[PDB]
Design a protein around this ligand. Sequence first.
Ligand SMILES: Cc1ncc(C[n+]2csc(CCOP(=O)(O)OP(=O)(O)O)c2C)c(N)n1
Ligand SMILES: Cc1ncc(C[n+]2csc(CCOP(=O)(O)OP(=O)(O)O)c2C)c(N)n1
Ligand SMILES: [Mg+2]
Ligand SMILES: [Mg+2]
Lengths: 801, 801
Amino acid sequence: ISNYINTIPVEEQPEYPGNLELERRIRSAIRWNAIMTVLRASKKDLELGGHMASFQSSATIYDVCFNHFFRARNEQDGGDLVYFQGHISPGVYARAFLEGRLTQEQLDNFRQEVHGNGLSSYPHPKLMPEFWQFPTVSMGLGPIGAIYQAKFLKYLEHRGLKDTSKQTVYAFLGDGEMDAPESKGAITIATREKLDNLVFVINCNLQRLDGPVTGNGKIINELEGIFEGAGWNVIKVMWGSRWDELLRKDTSGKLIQLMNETVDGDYQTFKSKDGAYVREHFFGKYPETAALVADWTDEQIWALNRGGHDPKKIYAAFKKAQETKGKATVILAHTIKGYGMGDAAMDGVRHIRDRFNVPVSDADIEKLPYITFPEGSEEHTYLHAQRQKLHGYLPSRQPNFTEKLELPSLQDFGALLEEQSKEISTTIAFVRALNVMLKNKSIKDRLVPIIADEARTFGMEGLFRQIGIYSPEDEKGQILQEGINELGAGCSWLAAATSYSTNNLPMIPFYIYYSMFGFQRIGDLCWAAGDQQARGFLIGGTSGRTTLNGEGLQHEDGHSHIQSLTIPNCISYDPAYAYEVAVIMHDGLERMYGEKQENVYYYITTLNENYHMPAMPEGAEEGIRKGIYKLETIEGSKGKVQLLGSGSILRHVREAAEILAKDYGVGSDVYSVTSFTELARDGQDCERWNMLHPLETPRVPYIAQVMNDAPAVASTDYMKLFAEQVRTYVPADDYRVLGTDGFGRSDSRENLRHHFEVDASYVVVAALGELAKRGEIDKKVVADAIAKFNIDADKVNPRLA
Amino acid sequence: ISNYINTIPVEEQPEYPGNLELERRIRSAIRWNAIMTVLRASKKDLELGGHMASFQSSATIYDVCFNHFFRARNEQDGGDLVYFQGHISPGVYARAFLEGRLTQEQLDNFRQEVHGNGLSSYPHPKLMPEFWQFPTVSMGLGPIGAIYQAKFLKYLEHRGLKDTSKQTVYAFLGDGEMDAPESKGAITIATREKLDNLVFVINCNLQRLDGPVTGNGKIINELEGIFEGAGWNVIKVMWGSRWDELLRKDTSGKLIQLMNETVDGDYQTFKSKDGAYVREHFFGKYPETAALVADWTDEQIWALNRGGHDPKKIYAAFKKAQETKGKATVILAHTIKGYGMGDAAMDGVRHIRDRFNVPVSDADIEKLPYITFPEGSEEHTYLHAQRQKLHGYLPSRQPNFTEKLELPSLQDFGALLEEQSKEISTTIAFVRALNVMLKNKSIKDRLVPIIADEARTFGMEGLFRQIGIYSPEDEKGQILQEGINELGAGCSWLAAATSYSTNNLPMIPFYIYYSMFGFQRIGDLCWAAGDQQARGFLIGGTSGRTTLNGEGLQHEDGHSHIQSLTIPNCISYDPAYAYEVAVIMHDGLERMYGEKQENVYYYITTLNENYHMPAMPEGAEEGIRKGIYKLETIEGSKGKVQLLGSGSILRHVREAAEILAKDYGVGSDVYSVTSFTELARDGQDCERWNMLHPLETPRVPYIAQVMNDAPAVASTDYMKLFAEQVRTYVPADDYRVLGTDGFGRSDSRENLRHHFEVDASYVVVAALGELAKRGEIDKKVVADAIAKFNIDADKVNPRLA
Ligand SMILES: Cc1ncc(C[n+]2csc(CCOP(=O)(O)OP(=O)(O)O)c2C)c(N)n1
Ligand SMILES: Cc1ncc(C[n+]2csc(CCOP(=O)(O)OP(=O)(O)O)c2C)c(N)n1
Ligand SMILES: [Mg+2]
Ligand SMILES: [Mg+2]
């Protein structure tokens, strides 16, 4: 680390280009409206919430940026991409209001958006589709999301898809937020990728929410040390302009020594006392430092401020960051939390009114009025002139992309709809589907294949020589290889899946990884992706509890689908055949990037197990998209059942169908369930609608339009709940579900499918059991089947194993 | 960053204390047996998998540790806590086999454990309770887990609970793994806490899985840079002993320069060529770097090895790490990937046998035999001699603690079982329950409250005064304040929740945080916690989609219970009342830390909403623990329904019962469901048993014993699936579920409960709907209820809003 002073000395500091006095009047009005918005919300006494102290500490930092740096979306590019610190939203709304982009009625509806004309608590594009762009309130995601957004912008330029050289990514972070592993865990990537189009602005007010970040330490030195060691350009903005005289005349170096040795805890104590106290405990530590302010009054000493509140020091930092190349820059802005709010941090708000010279009658304070600048006023003119120079207003968002893509038709995937020559897997099918898309002139170069180190495990080796690996294996490479870093790969996926909005340049990402390390490991990011309206594909490879048989407990995924169904705009599928993978990918491509432009993303689990891939049944396309279709009906005069399967288990369910017919004379209807989740949601929607329209023609759940009423059995490679979720909509009185509940373990696929009780043997027993209960066959038959199949009726429940 | 040479120069290198020749004979046998184990598995052609190259590159590092450093569990402490790199498992098994702790039959069942006498693919305590200790295969979790384990050990010492001063925590990592954000994301914490009982060992073989970590750079320099920047003591083990005389002879320092300028890509090139290619491209880079290897034969040059393969260099690194104080130490060990395997990473087997002078004859080689050292042999004597001087063998694990605790009885929670004067929340009930435990002599000091910055939000501040905050507010503080770091807090919780096994010292942790940032954010650690047999409590505060009303989309949790039900050994509850909280916590304590010592952990969601807390009905104990109990029955002659509710929504379900009786003469049975998940699991266990015992009387799900067959409606603050999961077990033919599917948004609780269609008015309408559908009432009564309650029948579906 370096001395606890500004990185940029006054001598190298550029002249401030703006009208400081005018900007302060405008800024004071914004601080005011921000506070009023939150206080009005508090007055309603509805537990609405909202913060004020945070924006107060960073208001000047943002003000300098809005006046001289942030470029808004324009005809050439999406402008600067600003990841606003989540809880300072009231400050963004206040400025928007003054710019005339929001009404008073909207500020009055802060945190009350159910009725349509309110404002979200935090930046949520899903709720405010034309205003916010990036979800940042979940601490940690913003910084890593920003790093990969910056890398993605360079990717677009290097690929020759769009000149993004005029765009900068700004990430506004708190110092307490930096403790989240995601916040610093990927800062080395910025150095590897030379992201000089990235700027981290860390508001260092030395405090978390409940207390100091490191009371007996110096968080600023800690941050400087690690970012410096990571190869970043660190710019510290420590002290305001009043300190310049002091640091300049102290030829003893004692003041610096004092600033260096004083810890975060003591600095916080000062900002709760007064001038006299600072003179005694701070400057009074050494005779040399005591002499520097001897001729100063207590008031003059109390005026000394931290750098993050001085427009001149702030400007210098951002300007230098804008000139730095070959690496990312992080600005450490020293501020005071609860700035100008007094001890606090009706009438008690007249303190801030006087502190910031707010032009509001001390008679109207009770009314908590909003301040506005009339058209023609000096303030109004200035406010708009500075923004026009920067191409308009920010934040803003375009919900749809403008261009028309010529997507491939289902027929282009024709080869995958036919019976396959060799035994392949759904993952191999996925790769072949990707190849078809890579032949489409319209979207071939808009495709963004993303992988988490493991590429050989997914047979992606072929695409390598074909489209190359992005490596600024060169700068024209198309595939993003992020190594052992699912969160990083996920953030790359997110930047690509939202490029249609951010840069009005639709890109179509396909991120394939070990399904177990999907939602379970980066679920918080998947939730934010939905909020950000991500349109892309998440491919969970090596999925299924019993399919990735040798890997064991931390790799065998039998629940990612349970996690994915919790995300509203995520459409999940678990196909068993190659032709289903084709119809699904094609449909998803059409829904998200076709004229419909549906705001959803897809999650498709694929397998690493090879088996026979039959041809798609004529007319099954729509059923595949809806979640279920009938594969075949097998004759049998001793009984009749329904058998459902998905993923790798479907082949075993079909095996059971044959066993039931040839050994027991039991006939059956076999169905391939491509999506239990979409069928469950369709059913929930139908039942909701019918309940609200009791007098009208009821809607029938899709699954009830496919299945009949004979006893049913379902088996999958996931936990029982995956198939049980449609119980309510299944038109049969008997519905037994087999699943892989329990921790995985290492063994052969055969042994695991027997252990998890989902193989053909268990399907037969479950089906016979249902028939026996209906008196259609003797219970002894079921008991003998259990014996014949060597089933241990008394082994421990797999869930407890 | 320092020069690309060893940190410890030969002049400061301690004398190696062991028999190099003999240790190598032992090591070669371990290398051989590890390889045989994987090869034999492969021959089965069951896609079992397993690695070899990784252990080959790091065997010498682990060998030095086993011979001179690793302390085994003993009478004083749990010994050294080693987080073994998961993929080197075959090497640990090979050694255990040689030490006579594993049989040949077990080795032959490598990756085949369904039948009971096999070995897990990776370290999984759940699968091998007396062998493995820490789950490490999920990349990234190992390093952050180890940091907090080391922190926890200091805590135990500072709190006077146990002297852990002789324990060292070792985390063995791969360089590719360091890319995981969690790997380096928390390293500054080790510095803040001066964790001199922690050692990171990074195997830098320059390659991850599908290529190098950073071919165009120097991964070792990147790692040194960020770890040095984070305040760690970095020890680089770059070159073997053969280089010493050379480097010493080097006067122009040109050799140093040569090494510094060469990047990972180059080094991996020489790593494949030959002794001649090296004197040309490497030593032939500069004239001065030629005279050094002039009097050297191509064979002598090709002999130059990397430091990670030199026991003398490795020993010096660990010795220095062992003596270092004030901070953590990281050892960067330079090795060769697929070391000694030449061919790959029968001729192949013969090759390795000759390379390591393995004592296997040509006549036995095709049998892929394991090697053993008979008692009395030199190897057998030394192997066991070294371990005995180090207190025994490891890894080893003790599944149950020996001590007997005197747990508080339910009566000790008496005040919580009675009606409350003041309106409070389930979170307030939780804090009071904790205070009761803090008055119990036997466990008061064993409790470990854990928080992530936010404390006042959960009303915990009342405790900070009593037990204090751990801060080496002092070293005796009992509460762990981890700041904005859910993952870090989760790791501290894990270290404490498994202390009963690791240090034979049961500790009872309670980690409270915003439920949204629970499984969704650290789900991979929660899965690992179940594998590690964690026993403790996870408290999801501010839960429920409509209850954390002002925060919005990324805070409103209506799905954490869907994520938690995927973890086999996690018991989940969503209580509505304070007495339910008391009963649940008491039972959890008894089960996990009483005589039963059950290996499960608890997840309990609590609320921030205050309301009337009634008294616990007499005899409701069993029901509360099971998941459901009948609260009351309300008379009605025009019909009868069953109403189920949980969490904050129960209050509204009871309100609906009143309206149904008063306004429509419809009576009902009202139930409080404390856990839909335990109920669903119970139901699944019964149906499974019934399916497997067709000749026996069907067992009845507990929920079916409590409920009757009248139409039922269920409503919760979570998505519909949470209540729908018990559909198959509910005795009624009609079961309607209301839930909070869809993205959250900001507003009053009233508007959100109406928006998500879960409030009183919707429960009433759902109930009436089932009655009308059955014929008990006219449809028009439903249509008018919808009008009367001002319900918008055409409002968009909340899941889509
Ligand atoms: C993952 C996550 N955990 C916790 C919170 C709750 N939270 C909101 S603000 C805050 C503290 C912010 O501190 P800091 O980052 O230092 O910013 P400041 O407000 O001081 O500028 C916390 C913990 C959150 N939003 N996300
Ligand atoms: C979270 C997670 N992602 C991916 C994997 C798959 N994986 C297994 S080994 C490996 C690479 C190992 O490379 P490194 O850490 O450098 O160690 P080495 O084996 O080379 O010694 C990967 C990505 C995993 N186990 N966990
Ligand atoms: Mg802060
Ligand atoms: Mg490696």
